[PDB]
Amino acid sequence: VAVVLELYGNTLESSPVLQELMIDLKTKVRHEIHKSKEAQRIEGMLQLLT
Amino acid sequence: XXXXXXXXXXXXXXXXXXXXXXXXXXXXXXXXXXXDHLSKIFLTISKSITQNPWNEENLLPLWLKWLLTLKSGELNSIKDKHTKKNCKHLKSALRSSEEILPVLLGIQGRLEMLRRQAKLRED
Amino acid sequence: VKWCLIIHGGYLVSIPNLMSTLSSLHSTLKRRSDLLPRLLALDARLDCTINKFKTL
């Protein structure tokens, strides 16, 4: 995705379905970010009982 | 208006960026971003943010955001002499926080872990 | 998982070896936890172009 970004920023402005897909990809990437957040939090909290 | 007069004052100023920082608007943060005076902003911005990784105000990091997103290409080739020494400094200045963001999210969990057991002591 | 750890925390203090027991659990938590800097990078990677296109 990163090499697609650095290569095709000039393409992604031009086609609006790419823009909508990047919007939904932003939401789902932030969803996985909060998944990373909760599994980071639960492992850190999990140190308390150990 | 608040930012244009400060831009003319920096066109002579870090207090000018702090004084146009009394606006706090992201649309103005994009509009004043295009209006090479953005390097004259960046010469105060890079120093102020390297001197402080923990500044809890928002318009200087969001201004670095709108500058590194709106001016993303040309900021590398203003100079390869004296901005890039500070650029090789700021990679060390920031990523120290990047190391502890997993740990700070860990203790962010470890706090509400005890908040919920204090609520369970309430009931 | 959350309220299980809320309610049974005091018992889970008492057993000495949790990583004996919670191993695949810890593996799942790390496996979402290790992807954090790649995703944090991808945020700025998206948002360069996001702040590029929606203005122009």
Task: Tell me what you see in this structure.
- Chain A: Involved in nucleolar processing of pre-18S ribosomal RNA. Required for optimal pre-ribosomal RNA transcription by RNA polymerase I together with a subset of U3 proteins required for transcription (t-UTPs).
- The structure is cut from a larger assembly and holds chains A (50 residues), B (123 residues) and C (56 residues).
- Chain A is mostly helical and 50 residues long.
- Chain A contains 2 helices and no strands.
- Chain A has helices at residues 2-12, 16-49.
- Chain B is elongated and about 65 Å long.
- By secondary structure, chain C is mostly helical.
- The longest helix of chain C is centred in the last third of the chain and has 18 residues, at 36-53.
- Chains in contact: A-B, A-C, B-C.
- The A-C interface holds A 1-2, 5-6, 9, 12-13, 19, 22, 25-26, 29-30, 32-33, 35-36, 38-40, 42-43, 45-46, 48-50 and C 1-2, 5, 9, 12-13, 18-19, 22, 25-26, 28-33, 35-36, 39-43, 45-50, 52-54, 56.
Short synopsis of the structure:
The structure is cut from a larger assembly and holds chains A (50 residues), B (123 residues) and C (56 residues). Chain A is mainly α.
